[PDB]
Design a protein around this ligand. Sequence first.
Ligand SMILES: CC/C=C\C/C=C\C/C=C\C/C=C\C/C=C\CCCC(=O)O
Ligand SMILES: CC/C=C\C/C=C\C/C=C\C/C=C\C/C=C\CCCC(=O)O
Lengths: 271, 270
Amino acid sequence: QVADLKAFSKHIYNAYLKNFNMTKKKARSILTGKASHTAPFVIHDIETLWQAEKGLVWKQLVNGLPPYKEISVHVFYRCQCTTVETVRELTEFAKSIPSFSSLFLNDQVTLLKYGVHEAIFAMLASIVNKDGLLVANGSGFVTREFLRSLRKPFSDIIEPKFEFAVKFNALELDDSDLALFIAAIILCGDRPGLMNVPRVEAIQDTILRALEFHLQANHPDAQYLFPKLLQKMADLRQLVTEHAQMMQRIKKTETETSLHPLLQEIYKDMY
Amino acid sequence: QVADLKAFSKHIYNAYLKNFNMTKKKARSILTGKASHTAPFVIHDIETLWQAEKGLVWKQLVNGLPPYKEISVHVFYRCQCTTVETVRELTEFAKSIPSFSSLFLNDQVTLLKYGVHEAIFAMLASIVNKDGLLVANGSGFVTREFLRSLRKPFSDIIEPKFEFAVKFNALELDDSDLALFIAAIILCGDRPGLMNVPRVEAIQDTILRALEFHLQANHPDAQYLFPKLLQKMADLRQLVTEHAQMMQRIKKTETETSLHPLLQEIYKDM
Ligand SMILES: CC/C=C\C/C=C\C/C=C\C/C=C\C/C=C\CCCC(=O)O
Ligand SMILES: CC/C=C\C/C=C\C/C=C\C/C=C\C/C=C\CCCC(=O)O
């Protein structure tokens, strides 16, 4: 409808504002180039990465790439630590969504388990750039070249994402739309082992209808509006599948590196 | 021909559906409970009014308030803007009535001139509620409480309209009834300066005749509806009289506020 479908798209927008510290616009700010309000320390190589591990600080001792842990793996650990944290915000974010907490715990776990990476890779575009990614809560900025200059096993696990972030930022969405887009991916009725599918499917529908109208009063000048955004959701589904594939293999050949137990829980039923 | 009269009535009903941007049906559906609700943006204070102007919006008239135009006057401005727009629709409505378009334009104008406000108040009831009314295609809803909190002048030209609307809605009329009713108040033979009254009187007769026959096959189980509507017309003729007197007062007293050129024309000899 209107107000009800207005106070719905807004409640999910505030939930999105108080659960995610870095917002697309708060981040599109830094990457800008005219506003020196925040000049992100660029990396691009081992040296600056080493100092950054001080000038940007990080709870893991000054760097640390011993014979048991190398550079590329350190980026990996860095990356999975962030992911584990984004999973936390996504959990709190969803718990704020209208009929989400209504579902039984097990069903909430099933939705997060299968949608947290899709939402993550979507938010990733908000802090990304054609030439790099914004890290360390806006304070830092690692170049895309550096990441491509990583070992053979890893490296090609972050590239495909940039490809996504690029195209996805062409649509020019803002945090208000993004909030509705994320709620929609988390509340997906196609997740395996879901118990009350009819319920989820129903909550998803209004999310999408809310998104639908919201794009009408926000982006009146294209056609991507919904179909293209619905196709991205499908694109994202594949990005994750491919992502999960690379994760298992890494775990199978990179015995050296450790995988966080939570990401292991998420990965073990995705084929 | 008692028959083939329900046809002339359906044509009038088509003229009503094609020309008015808001019908009672679409209106009564907005003020619904919750089942497939809509819930219009509410305006009940200066804040929400400001939020409306920016959100629900309208267009031009967003003039300040302390200077040569204030809050109450801003509502008055939006009031006459909705009034000038309803007049345009009423003109098209009438022109979609062959019998009406037969007459000479000068006569047509005299009819639109002395009947447009009466029709505007009958219809007002369709978008009105016991507590407020819809605005901007039903997108908004202004409370009755707010309106009555305006400066004494503007506030009391609004109240009487509600008193009328509430009692009018008790009759429970649908759009097809209103079409006949509104056509009746416009093709009225007693209008000042009417040139060919015998012609008008006759079209009025047919409309009221079709009106009574339509109320036959739409409101079977019902009291003295037909004549009850004839007294409403009389009541409408009086409400417009006191409205014109109140408009008179604002023209002499609220010199700072401006009136639309078309509306001054309707009140010139009125
Ligand atoms: C508040 C931060 C919000 C949104 C930004 C989203 C994501 C940043 C985190 C990771 C992105 C970097 C690389 C992605 C590629 C591989 C990581 C796999 C992580 C994992 O083990 O689950
Ligand atoms: C939207 C038009 C369709 C259906 C309803 C019909 C008419 C209601 C329109 C305007 C009435 C609103 C406020 C009237 C109160 C004061 C202004 C009187 C102005 C005047 O004398 O011409």
